[PDB]
Amino acid sequence: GLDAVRKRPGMYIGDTDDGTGLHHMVFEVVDNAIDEALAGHCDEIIVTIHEDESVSVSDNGRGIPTDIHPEEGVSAAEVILTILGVGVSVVNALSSKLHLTIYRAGQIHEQEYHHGDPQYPLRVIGETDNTGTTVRFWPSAETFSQTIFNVEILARRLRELSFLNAGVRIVLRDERINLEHVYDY
Ligand SMILES: Cc1[nH]c(C(=O)Nc2nc3c(O[C@@H](C)c4ccccc4)cc(C(=O)O)cc3s2)c(Cl)c1Cl
């Protein structure tokens, strides 16, 4: 039901004009990585503001499940990204593009979406000794009247999450000003 999200984004992500809803897009992805840390699976989260104005969030948790979901006939990861915290499916719906990478059970999986529509089924692209999830997303300029992330707004929330989740190392990178901050209680 991502149609409803695109039609009334304010109801799902908050104010699309004043910067709050825009930064909520990053916070929703980070909150999924924090849940992975609370469960004891993740101890490092890297949040990057890219030169292209996109944001990536990488965790070293379990990685989103990749096995086919019986009811849906597609990867569990696709079901989580494409069917309605508000959930990462809201971030996907309101992103012109989203790139998902999963490191799980010795394999690297990827899927790309445009406005929440998968471009191809989740595919294995290589081998890895690591586990975790990376989401890179480009917020839709059709939804958000401002799409430029403020490193100070992200920094304040990441500092809070670092404090509240001691033992998670949170790295904030802003490629636009070559900034890196490490939050580790
Ligand atoms: C940056 C980032 N990281 C994650 C992330 O790691 N999420 C993971 N979710 C699971 C998991 O629950 C799935 C089936 C589920 C997700 C939402 C609601 C209900 C169910 C199950 C398992 C498992 O059984 O191994 C592992 C994971 S890891 C997300 Cl989402 C985002 Cl965004």
Residue numbers in the entry: 29 to 112, 131 to 231
Q: What does the paper behind this entry write?
A:
Bacterial DNA gyrase and DNA topoisomerase IV (topo IV), both type II topoisomerases, responsible for the ATP-driven introduction of negative supercoils into DNA and ATP-driven supercoil relaxation and decatenation, respectively, are validated antibacterial targets. Gyrase is a heterotetramer of GyrA and GyrB subunits (A2B2), while topo IV is a heterotetramer of ParC and ParE subunits (C2E2). We have developed compounds with a promising activity against Acinetobacter baumannii and Pseudomonas aeruginosa, which are both on the WHO priority list of antibiotic-resistant bacteria. Cocrystal structures of 1 in complex with Escherichia coli GyrB24 and (S)-27 in complex with A. baumannii GyrB23 and P. aeruginosa GyrB24 revealed their binding to the ATP-binding pocket of the GyrB subunit.
Substitution at the benzylic position to disrupt molecular planarity and symmetry has been applied for solubility improvement in several medicinal chemistry optimization programs. Introduction of a methyl group at the benzylic position of 1 resulted in compound 27. Compound 27 was an excellent inhibitor of gyrase from E. coli (IC50 < 10 nM), A. baumannii (IC50 = 15.6 nM), and P. aeruginosa (IC50 < 10 nM) and also inhibited topo IV from E. coli (IC50 = 320 nM), A. baumannii (IC50 < 10 nM), and P. aeruginosa (IC50 = 29 nM). The racemic inhibitor 27 was modeled in the electron density of its A. baumannii GyrB23 complex in the (R)- and (S)-configurations with occupancies of 40 and 60%, respectively. Hydrophobic interactions were formed between the pyrrole moiety and Val57, Ala61, Val85, Val181, and Val134, while the hydrophobic α-methylbenzyl group at position 4 of the benzothiazole core interacted with Ile92, Ala104, and Ile108. Important interactions are hydrogen bonds formed with Asp87 in A. baumannii (Asp73 in E. coli, Asp75 in P. aeruginosa), the conserved water molecule, Asn60 in A. baumannii (Asn46 in E. coli, Asn48 in P. aeruginosa), Gly 95 in A. baumannii (Gly81 in E. coli, Asp83 in P. aeruginosa), and Arg150 in A. baumannii (Arg136 in E. coli, Asp138 in P. aeruginosa) as well as cation−π stacking with Arg90 in A. baumannii (Arg76 in E. coli, Arg78 in P. aeruginosa).
